[PDB]
Amino acid sequence: HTVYRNLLYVYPQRLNFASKLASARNITIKIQFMCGEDPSNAMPVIFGKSSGPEFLQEVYTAITYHNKSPDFYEEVKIKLPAKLTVNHHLLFTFYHISCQQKQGASGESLLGYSWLPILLNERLQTGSYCLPVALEKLPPNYSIHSAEKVPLQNPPIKWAEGHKGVFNIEVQAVSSVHT
Predict the structure, then answer these.
(1) Using CA atoms, how far apart are residues 61 and 69, in angstroms rounded to an integer?
(2) Which residues pair with 76 in a beta bridge?
(3) CATH architecture type of domain 3-178
(4) How far is CA 85 from each of CA 89, 128, 143, rounded to the nearest angstrom?
(5) Among 17, 147, 26, CA closest to 91
(6) Subcellular location, in the record's words?
(7) Residue 145: C-alpha distances to residues 9, 25, 38, 47, 149 (Å)
(8) 10/2 Cα distance (integer angstroms)
(9) Residues before each break in the chain (C–N > 2.5 Å)?
(10) Contact (CB, 8 A) for 19 and 27
(11) How many angstroms separate the CA atoms of 18 and 54, rounded?
């Protein structure tokens, strides 16, 4: 089966938290390609590891290199919808293990979110990005703005490290034949 598709490739590269604490290590990142802001708006567009191909609404990754080959890179491959609009965005959810929970629990919990609108200022958002992390939850209409500059919300947004960019990714669109 020879097919041709326009694909988005997303490389989660580095997560540079200043925190020296254990809660800054073993971060899991959930990645989704959204068509809206509701949890039900994750599109089944991420190529899975199995043959088919099988398409996923989310993938989970960890961006550490100590346990990987030196040649390793995480690559999220997405089948772009034929018409991309300002409502489409990458959504990243960060999970960690909070130091000292109730009853000494060690489970994983929500740390925060980041995102990247695929179209912004009438431009496709490819290239290198260093994104901040919003804590707790996301406000309505987050997705039409860059995470670097979101209008004042009520209740107000809180950001990791006082809004510093900490999450490095690379994004590229490639149209090619696949056999």
Answers:
(1) 15
(2) 10
(3) Sandwich (2.60)
(4) 9, 21, 12
(5) 147
(6) Cytoplasm; Cell membrane; Cell projection, Lamellipodium membrane
(7) 21, 29, 16, 26, 7
(8) 23
(9) none
(10) no
(11) 37
The experimental technique used to determine this model is: X-ray
Resolution (angstroms) equals 1.4
Element (H, E) at 55: strand 55-56
User: Hunting for tokens 């590891």 — which residue is that?
Assistant: 49
Strand order in the sheet with 89-96: 59-61, 28-34, 89-96, 109-117, 134-135
Q: Which residues of 40-61 are buried (b: 16+ CB within 10 A; e: fewer)?
A: ebbbebbbeeeeeeeebeebee
Q: Tally Cβ neighbours within 10 Å of residue 79.
A: 17
Contact indicator for 7, 176 with CB cutoff of 8 Å: yes
Q: Which residues in 106-142 are b (16+ Cβ under 10 Å) and which e?
A: eeeeebbbbbbbbeeeeeebeeebebbbbeeebbeeb
- Which of 135, 139, 129 has its CA nearest to residue 163? 135
Q: Residue 4: which H helix or E strand, with range? A: strand 3-15
Instruction: Please choose, from the candidates 168, 178, 157, 19, the residue with its C-alpha nearest in 3D space to the C-alpha of residue 92.
Output: 168
CA dist., res. 7 & res. 80, Å (int): 5
Residue position matching structure tokens 């500059």: 149
Domain coordinates of the chain in residue numbers?
3-178
